[PDB]
DNA sequence: TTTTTTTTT
C-alpha cells in the first residue's frame, strides 16, 4: 500500500515528499516509526504529526484478531529449501520467511557454501507453490565468487545468464555501510512489488569486531548492532522476505561460543551450528527455534553446493 | 583516484593536507575509514566530517551491481604461480590477488623456501597475461638470504641485477613495527601506481608469541592482531595486490594446531598445510578455500626453489 | 651507537640513566623494546614515551631497502670454522653470525667436544678475513674443563695463556640464572665494542626439564623458554655475534626426538644431529637450514678436538 | 562481553 492514500485524507502533498526523504514509502512504515522519529529528526510541529497518524488509522485496523483467523493470514509465509533433504526436515521445510535465521560455524564448516546454494535454490519453483524470485547478497568478507554459482547452476540444470542476472550484490566496506545499504534494500524491494524473496548477509559481526575494539567501546558496539537487527526484522515483515545471516565464533577460556552477545541471541529466531565431521561431511544442529526441536543431520559439501 | 578531486567540490585545500597526515591518499581510503576515525583522532569538527563524506559520494556509486556485471569487474584479479605444476592446480592457477593466502607448516616444510620462490616468479610474465612487477618482503625471523635468490634466478634464466633491484626489504624488530611498516607499504604502493604486485610477510605470529606471553595478555594480543589483519585486507583491495602470510604451529595435548586463534582462521581466505614426506618431497593440502576442494599434491625443494 | 645522541634532541639527561637501569645502552635497544615494556615496567607517563621514540627516528632510517643494496650490508656476517674440512662444507663455511645454530645429539656424540673446539678456533685468523676475538661460555651441566682446552691449543700451536684469558665463563645454577646472566652478556658486549665474537651456551634445556616437571607446568615452561630465545636472537643482531646452542634428546614410544617443542624448533636457524658411527667417528647431518641442503659428513673426535 | 596456550618418556 503506497503512501498516496493519505492526501485524500486532507494531508498536503508537500508532506508526502518529506516522508519519502527519510525512507518511508509504505503505510506500514508509518506504523513502525515512533512519533519521536518524525518530530525530532525532521523538526516539524507536533500538530503536523498526529495529522498523518490519524490518517493512517483510516486504513488497516487497530484491534485484535483471533488465533484462528490469524492462522490463515499466516499462509503467505514460504519456505526456501537448502539443497538437501535431511537439512530441510530440521528446519521444517527450509528457511522460513518473516524471520531471521542465523547459521554460525567454526572455521571451514560451509557458511559461504550455504549462502551460495541459496542464491540458486531460491530461484527455482519448489514446495508449497513457492515460485522463486530475485536475491540480494550483502557481502562483508569479500568471498562472493560468481563462477562458483556456475558450478551449482548446472546441478539444477539452469542456464548461466538467468542465474547471475537475478542476484544483486554490494560489498559493505565498513560498519556504517551495513546501515547505509539497508536504505537501498528497502528501496529495491519497494519498486518491484513482490519479486524479491531472499536477503542474504554474510558475517554481520565481521566488521563490528574491528571497528569497536576494546572494552571502552563495548557499550556502543551493542547499541549500533541492536538498531540494525530491529531494522532487519522490520524489513522482513514490511515486504515478506527471508533473512539469512552468517556468524563467526570465539573461544571461551573461563569450547567455542558465537560472537555477539545476548542482543544477537535474542533477536535471532533460528540458530544453526555447523560442525565438521567425516571428511566432506558436516553436522548441523538446531539450538534456538520457536517450533522445531533439537536434532542433528549431515551435509555433503560437493562440487555442486550442499547435497546428501 | 587521487584526493585532489574534492577541492573542486568546495573543500578547502587545507583539509587535503590533514587527510594526508593520517595516511589517506586515495578516494577508497575515505570509503573504508569510519566517521569516528576522523572526528575523534584528528583535529576536525562534525560539520567538517560530512562535508568530505558528501564530496566522496559525487564519485564511484553507492548502490548495487548484478552478479553478471560484477563478474567482468572481477577480471582484473591475477594469479601468481608458485613454481610447480601440481601445486598450481590446487590453488586454481596460483596465489590469487585481492585475498590473503596463509601457508602454515611444522618445522622444516619449506615456508621461507616458498617465499623465496615467489620473489622471482612474480617478476616473470606468465598465464592470463600477468606481466609481473616489484615485490615487498617484510621479515620477522631474520631469514631472508639475497644470495639464495641467485640460485633461483638462474633456473628461470634471469639476470642477477634485475632480480635483486625489484625486491624491497625491511625487518620488523617488534610487534609495533609490524603496524608501523604498513604505513610505508601503503605509501610505496601509492607512488608507482600499478607496478607492485606482491606483499610477502614472514611469520606474522613470530612476534606476537613473545610480546604478549601469558593468559592475562591474551585479550590484548588478539585485539592488536585483528586490527592488523583488517588493514592487510584493505590494502589488498585498495591497490590490487596479493598477500602471502607464513604461520607457525603449536602442539595440542588436550597432533599439531596453528598458532593464532579463530581470528586468524576467519580472516584468512586460503589455508595450506605443508607436511614432510619422502626425503626432499613435501605434501601440500588445502584446508580452507571458498572455491577449491580439499586435495593434495607433492613438492620438491630443489636447489632452484620449488619444483616437481 | 650509544644513547647520548638523544639528549641533544631535547631529552632530559635524567631519562638517560633510567633507560640504563633497565638494560638499554644502544639505539637499537629502543627499536626492539615495545612501548609496553617502557610504560608499564618503569611506570612513566605516556607523553614521556613517544618523546624518546620520536628522538630515535631522527637516526637510522624507517623505510625499505632493495635486496641488492641490502646484500652488501650482509657482508659483515662471518663464519667460524669448526675444525674439520668436511664439516664446514655442510654449514657453508662454518657457524654463521647473526643466527642461532643448534646441534643436538644423543648421548656421547661430541657436543661438549664441539663447544671446546670453538673456544680455540674462534680466536684464530681464518677465512673471509675473520680476525678472531674473545668468547663467552655459559655452562649448564658443569662439564667445562680448562685443561681440556690445553690439549686443543697445542694442535693449532697457540700459547697456553692467550687461550685461557680470552674465554669468559659462568655457571648457571638454575633456570632463573639463564635469564639473569643474559644481562651481563649484553653489558660485556657493550663495553669492548667489537671484540667478542662467539656466545656458546651448553644444554639450554638441561635446566628446564627439572624445574618445570609435569604437564600442569608445560604451559609455563614453553613461555619462559620463548622469552629467552627471542632475547638470544636480539643480542645476536644488536652486537653481531654468533650463538651456538647444545640440546638433549628424549625417546618416542608413540627412535629419538629432541627435547623442546615447536618453540625451540622454529626459533633455531640451523639444526645439526650428531650420531655415532665407526669407533671414534661421528656422523653429522643437517635438518633445518634456510640455504644448505640435507647432507652428511664424518668427524673424528681426537685428542686435539674435532678433526678428520 | 571479550579472547587460546602448550609436549613428555
Ligand atoms: N567447490 C567446492 N567443492 C567442494 N568443497 C569445497 C568447494 N569450495 C569450498 N569447499 C570446501 O568448503 C570449505 C570452505 O567453505 P567456506 O564456506 O569458505 O567456509 P567458511 O566458514 O565460509 N570459511 P570462513 O569464511 O573463513 O569461515 C573447505 O573445506 C573447502 O575445502
Ligand atoms: N680428549 C679426548 N680424546 C678422545 N676422545 C675423547 C676425549 N674427550 C672425550 N672423548 C670422548 O668423547 C665422548 C664424550 O664427548 P662429549 O662431548 O662429552 O659428548 P657429550 O654428548 O657432550 N656428553 P653429554 O653432555 O652427556 O651429552 C666420549 O666417547 C669420550 O670417550
Ligand atoms: N638450497 C637448498 N637446497 C635444498 N634444500 C634446501 C635448500 N635450502 C634449504 N633446504 C631445505 O629446506 C628446508 C628448510 O626450508 P625452510 O623454508 O627454511 O623451512 P622453514 O619452515 O621456513 N623453517 P622454519 O622457518 O623454522 O619453519 C630444510 O629441509 C633444508 O634442508
Ligand atoms: Ca566465509
Ligand atoms: Ca655435555
Author numbering:
A (entry chain A), B (entry chain B), C (entry chain C): 22 to 275, 284 to 337
Give the text the authors published on this PDB structure:
During HR, a recombinase binds to single-stranded DNA (ssDNA) and forms a right-handed helical nucleoprotein filament, known as a presynaptic filament, which then searches double-stranded DNA (dsDNA) for homology. Eukaryotic RAD51 and DMC1 both catalyze strand displacement and strand exchange. Interestingly, DMC1 possesses the ability of stabilizing mismatch-containing recombination intermediates (low-fidelity recombinase), whereas the RAD51 lacks the ability to do so (high-fidelity recombinase). RAD51 and DMC1 are members of the RecA family of DNA recombinases and share ~50% amino acid identity and similar biochemical properties.
We first solved the cryo-EM structures of human DMC1 filaments with ssDNA and dsDNA (homologous) in presynaptic and postsynaptic states (Structure 1, 3.33 Å and Structure 2, 3.47 Å, respectively), in the presence of adenylyl-imidodiphosphate (AMP-PNP) and Ca2+. Similar to the corresponding complexes of RAD51, both structures adopt a well-ordered helical structure, with six protein protomers interacting with six triplets of DNA. The bound DNA is organized into near B-form base triplets separated by ~8 Å between adjacent triplets.
